[model samples]
Target: SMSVKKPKRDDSKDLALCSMILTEMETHEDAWPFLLPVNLKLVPGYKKVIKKPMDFSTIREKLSSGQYPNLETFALDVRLVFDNCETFNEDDSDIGRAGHNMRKYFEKKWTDTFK
Candidate 1:
């Protein structure tokens, strides 16, 4: 049997870049698209109105291309974004909770690295 080699995960490095990219996204010329109305995601026309969000790997590709410079700003912006995260419908609802939890996952990642 052949064994497949798996790459090791480096969350610290990934978050540094992730936060920076999100920061750039905030200041981007078309940043308006990135801002959705809190808990506004469950509406019928939501997909048509907002630009589609990227998957993890796709975002990684974009970040690698931009090579954004300011890790400190990146870290700060991430904190701000999550701190103000808003949920659609009742935040305790399934859809709303799932979305909140998703953001929480990244928040934990970002904070864990800093700690």
Candidate 2:
């Protein structure tokens, strides 16, 4: 087994993070598969080995064994995900709103936890 990486043990932070993910999933039912990696990677302990065309439930199960990437690595992947996903727009499309809401959730949750 890989050595445990993230030594933190704050459930509140975990919950806040996952809460943003859950809200994002709810905003896009069919995108659950798309969202799992996006969500799980935000947690401190997850290996970055994502399957191509990743399946949601299968990946969700895989998260049990996910290992942490360091803070710099993690932030890099997060930035890439956001950029590839086309998240910003000053328009009225539902997808645009989902992206916006997801950002909002992250901002709020992140602020609450990291302070």
Candidate 3:
């Protein structure tokens, strides 16, 4: 008979750090699959093995699974992304403003197009 191992207790601090790292990596080009590895390397004393490659397919599947089991978790993920965006370097005001405007434009476009 095989013995079942109990899972470790939840660590909110570690989860928050991981969420922030994941969000930052997702913003960069082609960094999704490397999120776990990059974060683990950057942060000492945090170690975990990434068994599968990260891809948009998995993300889409999870979000569209028709299961609103944890809406708060999704909200926290988005909040982490917004919080981590401050860490990105933006020196020029014009470029930053342009990005901000572009986001507004795209947001409008998305709403209009979807509706």
Question: Evaluated with lDDT, which candidate comes out highest?
Answer: 1
- For model 3, residues 1-115, the per-residue Cα lDDT tens digits are 2687678655444334434433443565533332332254675433433323233233334445633244345434433332332233253544344334433443454344333
Give each model a TM-score.
0.38, 0.40, 0.27
lDDT tens digits, residues 87-114, model 1? 2135665554544655655566556655
Best by TM-score: 2
- Name every residue pair that clashes in candidate 2: 46-67, 47-67
TM-score of 2: 0.40
Ranking by TM-score: 2, 1, 3
Error of 1 at 67 (Å): 5.1
Model 2 lDDT, residue 81, Cα: 42
Candidate 3 RMSD to the correct structure? 14.4
Count of clashing pairs, candidate 3: 0
Number of the candidate with higher lDDT, 1 or 3: 1
Once superposed on the true structure, which residue ranges of model 1 sit more than 4 Å away at CA?
1-43, 47-57, 72-90
